[PDB]
Design a protein around this ligand. Structure first.
Ligand code: NAD
Ligand code: ADP
Ligand code: NA
Ligand code: NA
Lengths: 493, 496, 493, 493
């Protein structure tokens, strides 16, 4: 990795509409903070309802029949996405540093993981631009019938702060591949990197109005998008509680299409026949990755009783050795949490676990004086009824539960209103096949964890969300299917 | 051959209760409600009035039949196909009976119930039976030493709420894809037309579907229907009906367990007649487009746009056709139009007709009540209709035709698209470029060219805008009943 | 299993054209023999070139634009296929008995396997009739581009004798689903059941000429179809030897489309961690099923050296216990071979096994005084270079080979010009994944064998064939893709 | 359009194997000529069987399990195809001139059409590299069944001289996207541009052996490919004559998989209600494009009797004004024919046309003293039974036929053993729909001609070929489908 600029300059901090930069109508700004220091990085235009209104009008205009964007060859949408990826890669080092500054994650990870996954996401979806065929259909009678795969239209996209660049990419990729237009609301904690990418969107040559980004707060800017009478579809990633607000707001306004990707309490199951070294390291990664701030974190580590003690001992050892510090320091494995709000929410869950009888094995406290750093925390002898075993913590807090039989762990892992991910570690062919089929989760990993690819869909069962992102499936929510049924003189096979 | 067997005009009712675990239950409250014959306005029988407690019992049954290792989960996908095919066979066995009961309860002409509704039900179930073992998931060439793939699982417990305009067909549109994909059902049928759907439940048991796979709770909307939309253990609701209630369905889902929602709502579909259309065909098709099923179709061509050069001719012919349209007893062979489904719709349509006269639309024929018994309305045609008129914007859902004049093709595109509805549209023209341009330009879920109301199980149906979300029929109608699971496995060495 | 009629009466023994029965033009007939007794069942019309020509004309006229078959709704093709299935299920015991009479396979197997698979194949493909969509395609420019999935046309279908009814179903299913017409040439060894199905095809209501069946010999009737100038497509199942003749004939005639399913020498691989009891019975079934007359037979049983001796001893014991006898007797597991030619060929390979030093562990001789019964035969210590280890025997003769490492057995299994099927028995996930990927075989079975379904495609790698049958894939060779590209006033997404 | 180098240098004229240049084993060379002058451009290594043998070994080795190419991420195969197109675009101006130098087509066309389509083809297929999913299949019983989409392996690719670079890209795109390796035989008339791309294939970073190119003659190098025992699949494009030879060699050797794209005699149908101006210009393009050297050329122009005289009148005027000259002169619409052999053959056909009673309306002779230039030639009053209305001329010779009715024109247009393309020009929706359905041709254009897109498949009905290239369909022939069926403890939906 190239040595980072530990204080990268900010070039974009305004509202992005029609390929131009605007202050908020109200002229208001809000500060974004460095989670490693607690210091203000800069101010950013505080978009609200009136700003969203302007973004939607611009998106609506670019989606007009006969416009440059509507008329553009599908294959050229691909060229543009590929160009956007090239421009992102050109500026990879700057963006990786900016991502760490605003979010707190280690710079090595921003560079090698986040930025790499963004490039791969955009390059993958570039390929889909001219391949998502409709159908010609053998209907009865003297008719020829077919479907057009058309864009859904103006798409509001509301994204979180845990993976700012990658969440932006996950949203823009499929939306732009299918010819939609976007009004994006980035997280108030991490607006900067997505604003810079907006400039690259312009540089890549996307028509004005095709992508519009409105930085600002949720109940203001986000709520305005979700309630807007001229937004055709909304895609939301965030908390389960705001997912309700979004869905309610859609039904209360114009019945716009909705998809959601929410939180989880994903079970990581370690059978007695698992490779212990690999299972311990993967279980550590499964929980602690990205400061524990992953919707798919394996926050319920089920370990079979015969290997429980050894697993726990090893897990505690690895958690005590996890390096917490300056995310720009290459030795650092764990940066700070994203903000003070999350910081406190995690301290409350830690205290909760102690009160309700969970066994604190290591960590459990504040790791430093400045910023929002928390010690890697491991709870043992966790029971299903416990709050730390039911609710998403979104911090470096690991729960280890013991089980006995394979049919028991099935019932206990499935006993949840969440269903985002799950994992099984075993060497047995039959146990893996039985578990992968039995687990009620959108993604099941066998002998691995947090393996994402732009090709394989991702999304939740139950209250972890609805619909899928990534892969071919990710195009479905961005398609309005039109049936054209034509009277013909004589139908033949 | 399209000949119809003489109907029993007073078909016996065998089923009038809540169907749960392949058995008939009274409402927990023991309360019942009357279903009425709209031809006379008189009660046919009492039906058990399912409420939230009855829905709870239905959902627990569905959940149990959906347990891993259950007969329905373990059943071969191909066998699900055979059960759907068996159910179709049974419905065909009782076709003459089912058609008559559909007419008794709903009001539509018997010849249509037999030749159209029952036919379409058969074709829909037989279509989706074939999908049972063909809706493949994928193996996916993901990066690295991994083998990744998707399982296409069922969503789970599916709440299904349907209207009264096509009681049997709406039931089939729901059960076909849901059962094909291995789901279980709690269905809430319209209070106006519960009977035929309940008799089909009897055939479901006879065909050998495991107990709890399909549960039907007859009853009212805000009671039974809302209990389903808000239930904490229903995974998915699919609703057909008014846009207004669709909102309620979506809010209830977000307010409860964030269940998956698909909707098929109302419309105000533009039927567009270019000056180069075949006049005779366009006239008869537009008449059918509006007046089909007593005007009680969500996709009715309730804005007939006619190019100015053929406006006068088209209107004269449409009025003549509407005047000759026979209204009467649906079991009578002469009848093209039966009564509206109930008194509420009856007065509601009459209300819209009055507004049409009020706003200056020319009443060209009909406009009133057609008989002093039942809910019959005269076939009504309004001419010189303008975009801002109430009858031009709101769904009437009755035999009331709006005819509007236009000049250019650019004009008619903007006017037809100027609607919060977008369920269907049509274009009548002989020109290749005009048909292609209009079919692409119209913001509607289904666009018909030189025809109208051409539905097929193979072709997807659903709305743009506020006419719904998602699609039914075809391969697409399986997407909402599928839960996709990605399985990603570490392998020793990935090779192409 | 309902009781059989061990002397079914024959209703059809002529040439089937335009739904009517015809004698051969030459009026010649040929005997078909009951392989259990060696007695002549009846005479069958001997179709040749002139008869094939009349069939091709019948088919060609049924395929003309505006004909009942071309105009028929796709869904109705599904109705007709389901009706034929119902008619076959009605006459199930009759056809299962006639299959056993003419072929030799046990009645219990004819009834429970062959006929059940026939019904499931036809009902599966009935579902496909109206679901094999073409595409609408986002081409560059102001154009609308789509594809029509039309039928390929007059299909010549040449089938073998090992699974007379099933092989017929495998051909008719996909061809009729997609609206093609058929000239079918059935094996001279087993013509009766297929000719009876023709009667049911008529009864079901298929239009005249949609299916035409010409019994007769290969070099006469078969070659006539293969070289025919008005046959658009040929599909052949049989020996690799004759596969070449088909492919040469097609190229020398009208360049008709060709798909082939040919022989095999399929490896069945038993790892030391396999379930012994299961692997032994399954290896036995893998080789011995259908009197060893299966293209996918596990004719190379590779066994890991740690379990070799135990596996061999158990296999020998199971082979010695395999009941040979009257196929109508409920206890018979193995009937006679199909005819004298096959009978002599199998004895020849057995002699070859002894001559080359393979260890004859049991069987090896003639098992009855009349008919074509051969003792269940097992060779041990088989080497890759032996003839019985290289060539397809198509009889109750088993080859057991010893191996040491997983990479050794991969190279050894793949060292063949055959590649139709393979199997792996193991409890280990990683081994199972590595082997299924490494093996160059059309179907790889894991902890099972000979598991077919109409849903999953089947066909060979290398010289075991080209193309696939069954599943959605089986529709590909029976479709002719037409692109329609239309100029439009203005292309919009 | 960038000013061309009228005499571009040749850097590559040898055999390409393992990313290295070789002389032929025989050390022999052959001349390639500039068809505009008749002068030799340079000598090219004359590959034969012995050289084909080295290429196959290199390809086979490159395709071995565990090789860099077999292990490479599917998405990365996409990066390589994109990189290859990037390099081709860098060298676009040079390649366009060299294409013109060796082929004779106008430089303006090479640059704007040929090179543009090459870039679009390669980039389209780069998108397919990680998206051509196999299936998970709901088979009966306690089993999990799925398909892997594997490469077919060593693919022999034999191409002609009419679109040298585009034919190469049509073959390489789908082959490399799906993980295959290639032994390509370019036409002796136009080897140079494909040889240069090979240089760029090395530079792009494709592993050695993945693409090997062998220049040389047909009956030597090409036959060696079709007859080779370690070539799994062959794709051929060229004459119907040689297509037969390829198929026979395939069936005679190792039963390699075969797909063909052969000649045509495509009907272009002008209804009386067609836009006269558009139809006249399109019909001119349909025939005369690329010096008449297109397999899909509209060489049967059917004009309705009511507009015949005017259409002919306007077509003669256009033909008479079509600029023949130096392909590097921007005003040139038609360069020379590819070589003296085609030159004489076309002149021969012209002689036949006059002899058989066709009415010569203009052209009919040589257009220059130097090179192989032919006057744009129009025959009127052409009848279906004339040699020039039946046989593929492959030159600037136009056939105009008169018809009365729709039914008549369907019969006459379909009365051909060719079926590659067709077109209908009409303003009427029903006529267009009836005709596009009734026409037995691989591609049907409506109110256009020769509209190709990498997204829409291309291939012939009848003896114009088998299988399809371009689009999703173009991946089918480059995929070997493997079914993996696994026994599971308990199958659930
Ligand atoms: C396989 O095949 C071997 C021999 O069995 P078989 O000879 O009965 O199968 P085969 O390959 O000879 O015949 C298979 C089918 O093809 C037909 N056929 C035979 N010769 C033909 C030709 N020249 N042209 C066209 N069709 C022809 C046959 O009539 C039969 O229906 C067995 O040992 C087993 O390995
Ligand atoms: N007998 C043959 N076997 C294999 N390939 C051949 C044979 N003859 C020609 N070819 C090759 O096939 C390609 C197409 O050639 P061909 O069909 O002869 O068209 P043309 O005759 O117009 O050159 C060329 O690359 C040529 O070298
Ligand atoms: Na920040
Ligand atoms: Na026989």
């Amino acid at each position: 990795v190239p040595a980072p600029n530990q204080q990268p300059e900010v070039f974009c901090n305004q509202i992005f509409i029609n390929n131009e930069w605007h202050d908020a109508v109200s002229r208001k700004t809000f500060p974004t903070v460095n989670p490693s220091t607690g210091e203000v990085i800069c101010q950013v235009a505080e978009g609200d309802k009136e700003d969203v209104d302007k973004a939607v009008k611009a998106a609506r205009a670019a989606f007009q029949l006969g416009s440059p964007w509507r008329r553009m060859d599908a294959s050229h949408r691909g060229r543009l996405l590929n160009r956007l990826a090239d421009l992102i890669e050109r500026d990879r080092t700057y963006l990786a540093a900016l991502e760490t500054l605003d979010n707190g994650k280690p710079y090595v990870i921003s560079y090698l993981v986040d930025l790499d996954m963004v490039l791969k996401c955009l390059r993958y979806y570039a390929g889909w631009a001219d391949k998502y065929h409709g159908k010609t259909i053998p209907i009865d009678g003297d008719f020829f019938s077919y479907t057009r795969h058309e864009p859904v239209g103006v798409c509001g996209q509301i994204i979180p702060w845990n993976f700012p660049l990658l969440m932006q990419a996950w949203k823009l990729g499929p939306a732009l591949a299918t010819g939609n237009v976007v009004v994006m609301k980035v997280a108030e904690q991490t607006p900067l990197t997505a604003l810079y990418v907006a400039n690259l969107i312009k540089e890549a040559g996307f028509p004005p109005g095709v992508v519009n980004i409105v930085p600002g707060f949720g109940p203001t800017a986000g709520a305005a998008i979700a309630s807007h009478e001229d937004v055709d579809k909304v895609a939301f990633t965030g908390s389960t509680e705001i997912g309700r607000v979004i869905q309610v707001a859609a039904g209360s306004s114009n019945l716009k299409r909705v998809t959601l990707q929410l939180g989880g309490k994903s079970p990581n199951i370690i059978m007695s026949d698992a490779d212990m070294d690999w299972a311990v390291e993967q279980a550590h990664f499964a929980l602690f990755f990205n400061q524990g701030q992953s919707c798919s974190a394996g926050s319920r580590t089920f370990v079979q009783e015969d290997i429980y003690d050894e697993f726990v001992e090893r897990s505690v050892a690895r958690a005590k050795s996890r390096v917490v510090g300056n995310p720009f320091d290459s030795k650092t494995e764990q940066g700070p949490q994203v903000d003070e709000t999350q910081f406190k929410k995690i301290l409350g869950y830690i205290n909760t676990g102690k009160q309700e009888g969970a066994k604190l094995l290591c960590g459990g406290g504040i790791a430093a004086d400045r910023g929002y750093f928390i010690q890697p925390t491991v709870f043992g002898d966790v029971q299903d009824g416990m709050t730390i075993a039911k609710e998403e913590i979104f911090g470096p807090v690991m729960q280890i539960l013991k089980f006995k039989t394979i049919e028991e762990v099935v019932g206990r892992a499935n006993n949840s209103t969440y269903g985002l991910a799950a994992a099984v570690f075993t060497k047995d062919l039959d146990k893996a096949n039985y578990l992968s089929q039995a687990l009620q989760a959108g993604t099941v990993w066998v002998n691995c964890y947090d393996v994402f690819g732009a090709q394989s869909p991702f999304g939740g069962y139950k209250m972890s969300g609805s619909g899928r992102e990534l892969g071919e499936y990710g195009l479905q929510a961005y398609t309005e299917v039109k049936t054209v049924t034509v009277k013909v003189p004589q139908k033949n096979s």
